[PDB]
Ligand binder design. Structure first.
Ligand code: X77
Ligand code: X77
Lengths: 299, 299
């Protein structure tokens, strides 16, 4: 059970550097469009209250410089600009010759995706995250990583689901979907904002306990059961998400012979403390492995 | 708040090929005019118990090997010579990889981290990072057909290829070769049950993790007491720890925190007998999978 990411080559070929005035960050070049956070337009003196409608008017095509450093370089010419929620949509006069087949879909809490971290348009690392129940993610993002993208891949099709926007007050990160909406509705300004409480992703904890059983670690399995409806009542009071079963979870239950409701009961007990014991090299519950992850990696 | 980070894999993806010999197929690494792959692709499927690789090489002919590139513009690559180096084959092909990165071949040491590109049938499917264990295995996520998958580090634009995947051991752990051809831990590429040595804690990585704990406000384990490196290292031989070897990366953590290596070596001796009633970054067990370099670049 390792933290697995998709191979990043397809997305690396799309990363560019976008500069506007004194701001520089990353953009995603797909066909004739370069996507980037709209806060590239924010002046250094208006961090706390930018008017993005106003800033958009004051811009022309010549206000944005776009450079591709990786691979086959350029030196793109911006020939149009528009704003879409919290994103800039720049039109450039060359279609990216390495554009993958792609879609734009918003991810839901508990779902995993790969992130390609970039600085000044250069990819530097990749890792996998889950969208937290409070619509934040915990990866490794340093200064200038804005515009780094998160994505999944199915067959030949990349689903772009995240473009990094900002660090929040609790050391945590959020970003936009490519429809322009910010995950969790955070504002792209220097302003005090509160994030809701995080929660354990119940269905991923279930998947992880199934991975433990599959690896011969089942000391926590009892005959006792908690129904889904009763677990979901308990979860509201203990910062767990609502458990929603899936065909992926059912495959693990069939394979191990341990019912979902046995693991729901185990979670309730393990939340109280592991006593002196370990599960898959961990002394706490793990909720960043999805049922699909466990099925892929162990079956 | 450490995360498992891998290098972007695009450069390496462009070098992966599929190598077929008889009815056996696995992955190869295409650099300049050479394709590297595990020599057990020559082993007949009924003869896994103990092959004679010197003889198998002799019996190979002009067209015993088929190499296919699937990524990019697909192509058959004609094999024009074949050599053996340790547990790897070195196949000469008549076309040079037009996307050969600047590269070296260095053997990694236990405790060091590297990125792995997992492939099947010459097609990359995922990337993850591991540390070389003290018993010269790695805890990867590798399924059947992953042989030939490659591990590597990067410095600047130079890729250091350090691992080519060879086999899965009885305990689910994995081993492979360095590109000089030597199998890590001298494991034999035969269908023979063989014994891996007992694992150990990577001492320099536990030190790194204690430094990350101190950087995040968790320092209750720091006392004035010191254990010298030489004293720690003799203790380590009897208590399942690797020898401690300092590096410039560790030194930078010492400077940032004002805590000396020898204070943490003392602390490790105490934490090994027990955390008593406390936790370190929420955990009650020692973490040795993050390197000094990881902590320096992430915190
Ligand atoms: C203009 C605006 C909206 C206030 C803003 C300012 C800076 C950035 N940050 C850029 O690093 C960066 C680089 N280029 C442009 N911005 C960083 C960032 O969020 N600091 C926040 C700290 C206080 C709350 C507001 C901003 C950042 C660091 C590490 C990982 N992720 C992002 C993001 C948004
Ligand atoms: C010929 C030789 C040396 C005995 C051998 C045979 C099979 C493989 N394995 C290939 O999957 C595979 C695919 N193509 C060629 N080999 C698998 C493997 O190690 N089973 C071991 C089982 C008992 C001990 C011998 C090998 C494998 C599975 C998952 C992840 N990693 C490797 C590796 C080496």
């Amino acid at each position: 059970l390792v933290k697995m990411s998709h191979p990043s080559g397809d997305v690396e070929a799309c990363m560019v550097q976008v500069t506007c005035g004194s701001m520089t960050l990353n953009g995603l070049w797909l066909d004739n469009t370069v996507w980037c956070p709209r806060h590239v337009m924010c002046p250094a003196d208006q961090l706390s209250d930018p008017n993005y409608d106003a800033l958009l008017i004051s811009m022309t095509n010549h206000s944005f410089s776009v450079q591709k450093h990786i691979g086959a370089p350029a030196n793109l010419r911006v020939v149009g600009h528009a704003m879409q929620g919290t994103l800039l949509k720049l039109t450039v006069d060359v279609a990216n010759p390495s554009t993958p087949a792609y879609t734009f879909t918003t991810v839901k809490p508990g779902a995993a995706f790969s992130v390609l971290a970039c600085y000044n348009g250069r990819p530097t690392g990749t890792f996998t995250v889950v969208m937290r129940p409070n619509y934040t993610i915990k990866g490794s993002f340093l200064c200038g990583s804005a515009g780094s993208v998160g994505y999944t891949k199915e067959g030949s099709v990349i689903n772009f689901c995240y473009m990094h926007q900002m660090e929040l007050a609790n050391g945590t990160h959020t970003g936009s979907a490519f429809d322009g909406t910010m995950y969790g509705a955070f504002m792209d300004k220097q302003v005090h904002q509160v994030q809701l409480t995080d929660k354990y992703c119940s269905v991923n904890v279930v998947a992880w306990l199934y991975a433990a059983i599959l690896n011969g670690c089942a000391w926590f399995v009892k005959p006792n059961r908690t129904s889904v409806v009763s677990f979901n009542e308990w979860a509201l009071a203990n910062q767990f998400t609502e458990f929603v079963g899936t065909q992926s979870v059912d495959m693990l239950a069939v394979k191990t012979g341990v019912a979902i409701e046995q693991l729901l009961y185990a979670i309730q007990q393990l939340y109280t403390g592991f006593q002196g014991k370990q599960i898959l090299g961990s002394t706490m519950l793990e909720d960043e492995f999805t049922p699909e992850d466990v099925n892929m990696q162990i079956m």
